[PDB]
Amino acid sequence: DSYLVLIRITPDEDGKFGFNLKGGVDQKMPLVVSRINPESPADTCIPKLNEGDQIVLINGRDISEHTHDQVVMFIKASRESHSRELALVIRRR
Amino acid sequence: TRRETQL
Secondary structure (H helix, E strand, O other): OOEEEEEEEOOOOOOOOOEEEEEEOOOOEEEEEEEEOOOOHHHHOOOOOOOOOEEEEEOOEEOOOOOHHHHHHHHHHOOOOOOOOEEEEEEEO | OOOEEEO
8 A cells, every 4th residue: 555755855045844744643633744845855856755745754763652843843953963954754645 | 723834
């Protein structure tokens, strides 16, 4: 059925990756991409991120028990990190 | 209500 994709994204000049997140443990919904911003780093890397992608790992961290705000802070922190790069493992239908 | 966050 479903499959896993590892997307590497580096942020643009505003520190933005170009996607929208919904979900988290505090919401009663899984963590999914709800928008790809066209031409953004998320849209242009290869492989690229798609709307509806379910986030599984963030830089290898298992996030299935984190809040929306925690997942957001994890993503923002990958920016000023070792390689400046965000590694996402997503599940795609 | 339900959260959507731009990043």
